[PDB]
Design a protein around this ligand. Structure first.
Ligand SMILES: Nc1ncnc2c1ncn2[C@@H]1O[C@H](COP(=O)(O)OP(=O)(O)O)[C@@H](O)[C@H]1O
Lengths: 152, 154
């Protein structure tokens, strides 16, 4: 599994209705989550644990000290198959390394459940899987973290 | 080198000093969050620029993944992001030792920006404020997030 984690002051998620807002968070994280074809539940578990526990906020005096849970902040989890974009061949990407959309959705849904189980069910916002999304992100820093579980 | 590329309808970059001040802004195009590694070479930088400018990340009529940022006269906002070399394998406090140290990172970054302008056009390349806190309002389009690590390349 691949995840891009961005530290945000807020994120507003819209779909085409011109656009209607379905999701919104204030301070916290937007997590762009790529699901590999070979991902197991242990790959999911690692990403979840890292997203929830990574110490990405300062606590004056201390840098990199508080996580999303510590500060009662929110997470928006967005599925991003493009994170397996093969950009090595030419300039046209292909995405064959990403999990096929049906088994990806189920896996994703299980991840959201576990996010809610490990943190709080009110603090976990989502997009519309598969659908086109407009997301206004207020990047705080910016702070961008990347994790690939196949490096673990 | 590491880069996170996001397809945008717009991005608005502010810095400190009502309390925030807008310094850069693009419409359609890419925000590229760029991480510079300790041992990055000009060849790593060249690969990043080539891909950012030439990756076909936009639709065109009946065709998907067909047009690149240059094809559409779109813009690039290039932001230095050392946090991309944040090691998180050992505990939950990130370790950034593998990121090129600031002074060397800044000159390498500015060289990269110069080459972007040379390979595309000056007026289409936007930047932030290196080593400074930034507030970046990004309108993600899709979203479409691309990740490239040049170490994976030979
Ligand atoms: N894992 C995936 N999840 C969602 N969409 C995908 C995925 N893989 C490919 N796509 C989309 O489907 C289209 C066709 O891909 P596919 O039929 O899998 O292979 P190919 O491009 O070689 O025919 C692409 O334009 C891409 O946007």
């Amino acid at each position: 599994m691949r995840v891009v984690i961005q530290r945000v002051k807020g994120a507003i998620l819209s779909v085409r209705k011109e656009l209607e807002i379905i999701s919104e968070i204030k301070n916290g994280l937007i997590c762009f989550l790529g699901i590999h074809k070979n991902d197991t539940w242990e790959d999911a578990l690692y990403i979840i644990r890292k997203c929830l526990n990574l110490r990405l906020w300062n606590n004056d005096n201390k840098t990199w000290d508080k996580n999303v849970k510590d500060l009662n902040y929110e997470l928006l989890i967005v599925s991003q198959f493009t994170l397996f974009g093969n950009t090595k061949k030419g300039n046209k990407p292909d995405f064959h390394l990403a999990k096929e959309p049906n088994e990806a959705l189920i896996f994703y849904n299980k991840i959201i459940d576990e996010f809610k189980k490990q943190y709080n069910d009110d603090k976990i916002k989502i997009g519309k899987f598969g659908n086109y999304m407009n997301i206004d992100v207020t990047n705080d820093g910016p702070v961008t973290i990347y994790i690939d579980t196949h490096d673990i």
